[PDB]
């Protein structure tokens, strides 16, 4: 298969610098031009720059002297992007793409998965994970809705699975909302009245940024 | 540089139904390309050189156009056709993508399955009280949610978050969370959550009393 | 003429075993002839280098031992030609072409020694001249030599062994088998009437010649340029433009070589001693410019990989192109023995790289490499000046092995030859034959 795997993107301070890295596997990475495209949260795809196989011509978007530095290590099958004096404008999902052509009007042939760059003064904070069980005198229906609230972690992302990913139908995890330099989100799992509380439903959260893995059991109230 | 504006910024359409977005350029442009982005996946090259389908791209898809106007089109939309379609140009330099056109399924209205939750004994212990209210599996995505503390409307401390349209059933979902201090939370007894949809004139009250 | 054709058709391609065998031996000798010739040019060019070391302190004395050494070897080569074989001056492809029209003699007992040793002096002095001229004429004569020695009779044998000589001659000069055969077929045969040149045999001589060369040269190629990028369809129009540029330059360059023959003939009038002295100064200017500014001198094969890789500036490319236009005229139009092919590759590359440069900067949406424009412009002075484009193409295809660039090479080349025709220009080798045949009558 042909695989682009970029890495390096995390949390950085304003005015700092970061070096992104794209790992090409399954094709002759030489002979291709490589390019970087980034997508600011809920916005369009924007072009950073490109590099030609012999590194002899490197073009960048109409933006700033030493802002971007594209380079490639043809021997290591890896492509690199250095962003400097990082603003909050640069908080985005960064894509690594290979370039090709048809009639000679160049397109973005194969894209990679991406890596997310978060630019904030806010400090890493682990989430507090609280169970949402239905109220004491609940209207015990055929389906029962449970939840768990993941409150006050930074930065994105947290992953939420139920019973280690076995309970997969009827789950929703909402988008985290940000307030006062922290994130909160919650997950819903609907099961049948016969499942809970007869068997155990568990909410597993991981915030890697803060080395947090935690399981919170949902138990009935009162 | 050359600015590209896609036309139905968002749109819905039933399966087996004929979809058509637009790409429009501030100057003259040659041989546009189109990428399909599903939520959580890398953009896929979908159509290139104004018209040519990439290997895999099902044949219902098709592009067309000239100069300053192009278009994508699905003769019989499928379920798996729901994604964002980005148009892109390199006839000029540098190159430019389009704003996006979000394609979502259209379906029968469904009403929200509302659920209300009291702050956990755990969160309370640490000193806060967040009341969570799940509004689950409805269509369309427009909804309003109102909170009542001892039957009086409350506006501060409420944050809501919709999911992206669902994979399996192509409904939405949306949570609303009212956060107070444990202090303010214990002053009052009845917390109520009212989902005001389109599928009824009469809101869906769910609530609980601390007693 | 139907019953005649039915008869001729069934008798096609039955070359006499005697010409097929004699084609083999002509090629073998021309290969050895060429190989020896190359090795000898290289050994003189070395000696010249080893002299500038024994005298590398006294920069004025340096510039002096550099001028004299190339002048002495140049004069030796001018003299060898006027005194003993006057039609071994210049390239010599015009003569072998004439010999096939049966209008010019093949004085092999005289020119074989005159061209070989005379060429070794001019080429090995570092004048701007090609190995083509010498090896193609030397090899034509070697073809006559063996025609006489074995007294084969017929037009077939005379024309054939003459032809496979020139072919084996050009192949062994550029390690270019296909380019040799296609040189006879497009350029060397008599152009206004039928001929009996057996092509199966020109092939046997070319094979043998090229094997001889591979026996003394392998593992290193004449031009190593690596594998470049492709050309996308929306780029082609830029190569057809480049050819148009060459097609107006081709004929201007023709005019300059002809008039420079005249302008330099006024210098000696005909006088075997003024002439030799002039080529001492010409060869000595070359031996100097080869120390103080190498890319303006020599055969030109040295700077082609450098120019393709974009390692010269646009300002250097302009310099080189003007200077090399000049020292090609001083050296080829003087009549010193040696070809013009190889320095027309250089000129065409340098001009092609510079146009590639401008096209890169004007069109970043095209994602150009300037090296692909040099490779299309290598065969383009051949095509616009001497009007053998199918030979320059297969020559340039063979030496650089970038088949993916076939379309922009063809396209530039037709552009060059079409604008050369349409701006009123003449194939360089034929307009030299004509001026030669037009004085071999105007004396009466
Ligand atoms: Br000549
Ligand atoms: Br040469």
mmCIF file of C-alpha atoms in Angstrom, chain C residues 27-208:
data_model
loop_
_atom_site.group_PDB
_atom_site.id
_atom_site.type_symbol
_atom_site.label_atom_id
_atom_site.label_comp_id
_atom_site.label_asym_id
_atom_site.label_seq_id
_atom_site.Cartn_x
_atom_site.Cartn_y
_atom_site.Cartn_z
ATOM 1 C CA UNK C 27 33.465 -1.446 -39.343
ATOM 2 C CA UNK C 28 36.111 -3.242 -37.303
ATOM 3 C CA UNK C 29 38.926 -1.053 -38.601
ATOM 4 C CA UNK C 30 36.922 2.186 -38.252
ATOM 5 C CA UNK C 31 36.230 1.212 -34.650
ATOM 6 C CA UNK C 32 39.926 0.680 -33.983
ATOM 7 C CA UNK C 33 40.677 3.789 -36.026
ATOM 8 C CA UNK C 34 38.294 5.862 -33.906
ATOM 9 C CA UNK C 35 39.326 4.260 -30.605
ATOM 10 C CA UNK C 36 43.017 4.948 -31.315
ATOM 11 C CA UNK C 37 42.097 8.472 -32.387
ATOM 12 C CA UNK C 38 40.197 9.201 -29.174
ATOM 13 C CA UNK C 39 42.911 7.745 -26.916
ATOM 14 C CA UNK C 40 45.451 9.884 -28.753
ATOM 15 C CA UNK C 41 43.485 13.094 -28.346
ATOM 16 C CA UNK C 42 43.081 12.317 -24.648
ATOM 17 C CA UNK C 43 46.831 11.686 -24.173
ATOM 18 C CA UNK C 44 47.741 15.062 -25.679
ATOM 19 C CA UNK C 45 45.141 16.867 -23.556
ATOM 20 C CA UNK C 46 46.783 15.204 -20.559
ATOM 21 C CA UNK C 47 50.319 16.239 -21.527
ATOM 22 C CA UNK C 48 49.036 19.803 -21.862
ATOM 23 C CA UNK C 49 47.678 19.609 -18.312
ATOM 24 C CA UNK C 50 50.953 18.217 -16.946
ATOM 25 C CA UNK C 51 52.778 21.184 -18.445
ATOM 26 C CA UNK C 52 50.712 23.817 -16.638
ATOM 27 C CA UNK C 53 51.773 22.070 -13.399
ATOM 28 C CA UNK C 54 55.541 22.235 -14.010
ATOM 29 C CA UNK C 55 54.987 26.002 -14.513
ATOM 30 C CA UNK C 56 52.137 26.805 -12.110
ATOM 31 C CA UNK C 57 53.963 29.551 -10.166
ATOM 32 C CA UNK C 58 54.611 32.176 -12.859
ATOM 33 C CA UNK C 59 51.057 33.003 -13.996
ATOM 34 C CA UNK C 60 52.354 35.034 -16.976
ATOM 35 C CA UNK C 61 54.696 32.169 -17.908
ATOM 36 C CA UNK C 62 51.703 29.925 -17.208
ATOM 37 C CA UNK C 63 49.532 31.758 -19.727
ATOM 38 C CA UNK C 64 52.478 31.562 -22.172
ATOM 39 C CA UNK C 65 53.263 27.830 -21.992
ATOM 40 C CA UNK C 66 49.509 27.307 -22.326
ATOM 41 C CA UNK C 67 49.204 29.348 -25.533
ATOM 42 C CA UNK C 68 52.301 27.993 -27.266
ATOM 43 C CA UNK C 69 51.546 24.319 -26.625
ATOM 44 C CA UNK C 70 48.122 24.506 -28.287
ATOM 45 C CA UNK C 71 49.508 26.669 -31.126
ATOM 46 C CA UNK C 72 52.292 24.213 -31.935
ATOM 47 C CA UNK C 73 49.919 21.219 -32.136
ATOM 48 C CA UNK C 74 47.383 23.305 -34.088
ATOM 49 C CA UNK C 75 49.925 24.467 -36.708
ATOM 50 C CA UNK C 76 51.147 20.894 -37.046
ATOM 51 C CA UNK C 77 47.571 19.994 -37.973
ATOM 52 C CA UNK C 78 46.971 22.898 -40.329
ATOM 53 C CA UNK C 79 50.216 22.141 -42.154
ATOM 54 C CA UNK C 80 49.504 18.395 -42.478
ATOM 55 C CA UNK C 81 46.356 19.378 -44.392
ATOM 56 C CA UNK C 82 47.397 22.075 -46.859
ATOM 57 C CA UNK C 83 50.653 20.308 -47.720
ATOM 58 C CA UNK C 84 49.440 16.719 -48.146
ATOM 59 C CA UNK C 85 45.605 16.489 -48.201
ATOM 60 C CA UNK C 86 43.638 19.747 -48.605
ATOM 61 C CA UNK C 87 40.166 18.114 -48.455
ATOM 62 C CA UNK C 88 40.798 16.794 -44.910
ATOM 63 C CA UNK C 89 40.390 20.315 -43.591
ATOM 64 C CA UNK C 90 37.256 21.201 -41.590
ATOM 65 C CA UNK C 91 34.684 18.521 -40.862
ATOM 66 C CA UNK C 92 35.024 16.304 -43.946
ATOM 67 C CA UNK C 93 31.401 15.090 -43.973
ATOM 68 C CA UNK C 94 30.923 17.349 -47.035
ATOM 69 C CA UNK C 95 33.595 15.360 -48.908
ATOM 70 C CA UNK C 96 32.229 11.886 -48.026
ATOM 71 C CA UNK C 97 28.818 13.216 -49.059
ATOM 72 C CA UNK C 98 30.353 14.366 -52.365
ATOM 73 C CA UNK C 99 32.053 11.002 -52.853
ATOM 74 C CA UNK C 100 28.619 9.405 -52.777
ATOM 75 C CA UNK C 101 27.401 11.823 -55.477
ATOM 76 C CA UNK C 102 30.503 10.630 -57.372
ATOM 77 C CA UNK C 103 31.781 14.151 -57.739
ATOM 78 C CA UNK C 104 34.772 14.007 -55.342
ATOM 79 C CA UNK C 105 37.669 11.581 -54.896
ATOM 80 C CA UNK C 106 38.442 9.357 -51.920
ATOM 81 C CA UNK C 107 42.192 9.930 -51.583
ATOM 82 C CA UNK C 108 42.615 7.453 -48.805
ATOM 83 C CA UNK C 109 46.404 6.952 -49.081
ATOM 84 C CA UNK C 110 46.696 10.694 -48.237
ATOM 85 C CA UNK C 111 43.853 11.695 -45.903
ATOM 86 C CA UNK C 112 43.816 8.730 -43.468
ATOM 87 C CA UNK C 113 47.283 9.809 -42.240
ATOM 88 C CA UNK C 114 46.526 13.518 -42.794
ATOM 89 C CA UNK C 115 43.192 13.521 -40.932
ATOM 90 C CA UNK C 116 44.237 11.283 -38.028
ATOM 91 C CA UNK C 117 47.510 13.064 -37.145
ATOM 92 C CA UNK C 118 46.228 16.477 -38.195
ATOM 93 C CA UNK C 119 43.093 16.004 -36.096
ATOM 94 C CA UNK C 120 45.037 14.757 -33.067
ATOM 95 C CA UNK C 121 46.858 18.076 -33.211
ATOM 96 C CA UNK C 122 43.854 20.342 -33.429
ATOM 97 C CA UNK C 123 41.526 18.339 -31.147
ATOM 98 C CA UNK C 124 44.319 17.474 -28.704
ATOM 99 C CA UNK C 125 45.247 21.113 -28.491
ATOM 100 C CA UNK C 126 41.781 21.832 -27.105
ATOM 101 C CA UNK C 127 40.347 23.700 -30.057
ATOM 102 C CA UNK C 128 36.563 23.877 -30.380
ATOM 103 C CA UNK C 129 36.135 20.896 -32.725
ATOM 104 C CA UNK C 130 34.421 17.525 -32.658
ATOM 105 C CA UNK C 131 35.636 13.964 -32.964
ATOM 106 C CA UNK C 132 32.818 13.502 -35.505
ATOM 107 C CA UNK C 133 34.509 15.141 -38.475
ATOM 108 C CA UNK C 134 37.687 13.087 -38.170
ATOM 109 C CA UNK C 135 36.146 9.692 -37.363
ATOM 110 C CA UNK C 136 33.449 10.052 -40.062
ATOM 111 C CA UNK C 137 35.908 11.015 -42.820
ATOM 112 C CA UNK C 138 38.628 8.645 -41.567
ATOM 113 C CA UNK C 139 36.043 5.890 -41.614
ATOM 114 C CA UNK C 140 34.752 6.732 -45.083
ATOM 115 C CA UNK C 141 38.284 6.549 -46.425
ATOM 116 C CA UNK C 142 38.926 3.332 -44.522
ATOM 117 C CA UNK C 143 35.906 2.058 -46.452
ATOM 118 C CA UNK C 144 37.498 2.999 -49.787
ATOM 119 C CA UNK C 145 40.878 1.629 -48.730
ATOM 120 C CA UNK C 146 39.390 -1.854 -48.338
ATOM 121 C CA UNK C 147 37.389 -1.467 -51.541
ATOM 122 C CA UNK C 148 40.610 -0.912 -53.412
ATOM 123 C CA UNK C 149 42.682 -3.486 -51.500
ATOM 124 C CA UNK C 150 40.150 -6.232 -52.326
ATOM 125 C CA UNK C 151 39.188 -4.624 -55.700
ATOM 126 C CA UNK C 152 35.485 -5.272 -55.236
ATOM 127 C CA UNK C 153 33.474 -4.142 -58.233
ATOM 128 C CA UNK C 154 30.001 -2.695 -58.604
ATOM 129 C CA UNK C 155 28.277 0.480 -57.525
ATOM 130 C CA UNK C 156 26.760 -1.387 -54.546
ATOM 131 C CA UNK C 157 30.139 -2.154 -52.969
ATOM 132 C CA UNK C 158 31.583 1.311 -53.614
ATOM 133 C CA UNK C 159 28.594 3.160 -52.199
ATOM 134 C CA UNK C 160 27.954 0.639 -49.441
ATOM 135 C CA UNK C 161 31.475 0.260 -48.050
ATOM 136 C CA UNK C 162 31.827 4.022 -48.401
ATOM 137 C CA UNK C 163 28.608 4.446 -46.450
ATOM 138 C CA UNK C 164 29.181 1.859 -43.731
ATOM 139 C CA UNK C 165 32.526 3.557 -43.238
ATOM 140 C CA UNK C 166 30.968 6.925 -42.428
ATOM 141 C CA UNK C 167 28.293 5.205 -40.306
ATOM 142 C CA UNK C 168 30.715 3.118 -38.247
ATOM 143 C CA UNK C 169 32.623 6.410 -38.160
ATOM 144 C CA UNK C 170 29.872 8.408 -36.442
ATOM 145 C CA UNK C 171 28.688 5.571 -34.195
ATOM 146 C CA UNK C 172 32.153 4.995 -32.796
ATOM 147 C CA UNK C 173 32.519 8.764 -32.204
ATOM 148 C CA UNK C 174 29.447 9.111 -29.983
ATOM 149 C CA UNK C 175 28.921 5.483 -28.863
ATOM 150 C CA UNK C 176 25.752 6.062 -30.938
ATOM 151 C CA UNK C 177 24.930 2.995 -33.136
ATOM 152 C CA UNK C 178 21.412 4.117 -34.160
ATOM 153 C CA UNK C 179 22.607 7.674 -34.738
ATOM 154 C CA UNK C 180 25.179 6.436 -37.229
ATOM 155 C CA UNK C 181 22.768 4.351 -39.342
ATOM 156 C CA UNK C 182 20.229 7.175 -39.246
ATOM 157 C CA UNK C 183 22.958 9.600 -40.335
ATOM 158 C CA UNK C 184 23.539 7.708 -43.549
ATOM 159 C CA UNK C 185 19.793 7.195 -44.110
ATOM 160 C CA UNK C 186 18.628 10.795 -43.496
ATOM 161 C CA UNK C 187 21.752 12.828 -44.307
ATOM 162 C CA UNK C 188 24.617 11.025 -46.009
ATOM 163 C CA UNK C 189 23.105 9.138 -48.974
ATOM 164 C CA UNK C 190 22.751 10.995 -52.334
ATOM 165 C CA UNK C 191 19.664 13.047 -51.755
ATOM 166 C CA UNK C 192 18.144 13.564 -55.233
ATOM 167 C CA UNK C 193 18.221 10.040 -56.712
ATOM 168 C CA UNK C 194 17.948 6.336 -55.926
ATOM 169 C CA UNK C 195 20.891 4.418 -54.371
ATOM 170 C CA UNK C 196 22.080 0.847 -53.779
ATOM 171 C CA UNK C 197 23.558 1.390 -50.276
ATOM 172 C CA UNK C 198 22.866 -1.941 -48.586
ATOM 173 C CA UNK C 199 21.381 -1.085 -45.176
ATOM 174 C CA UNK C 200 21.777 -4.574 -43.786
ATOM 175 C CA UNK C 201 25.495 -4.003 -44.383
ATOM 176 C CA UNK C 202 25.753 -0.455 -42.938
ATOM 177 C CA UNK C 203 24.280 -2.208 -39.922
ATOM 178 C CA UNK C 204 27.003 -4.882 -39.825
ATOM 179 C CA UNK C 205 29.722 -2.241 -39.975
ATOM 180 C CA UNK C 206 28.034 -0.174 -37.300
ATOM 181 C CA UNK C 207 27.670 -3.184 -34.999
ATOM 182 C CA UNK C 208 31.359 -4.082 -35.393
#
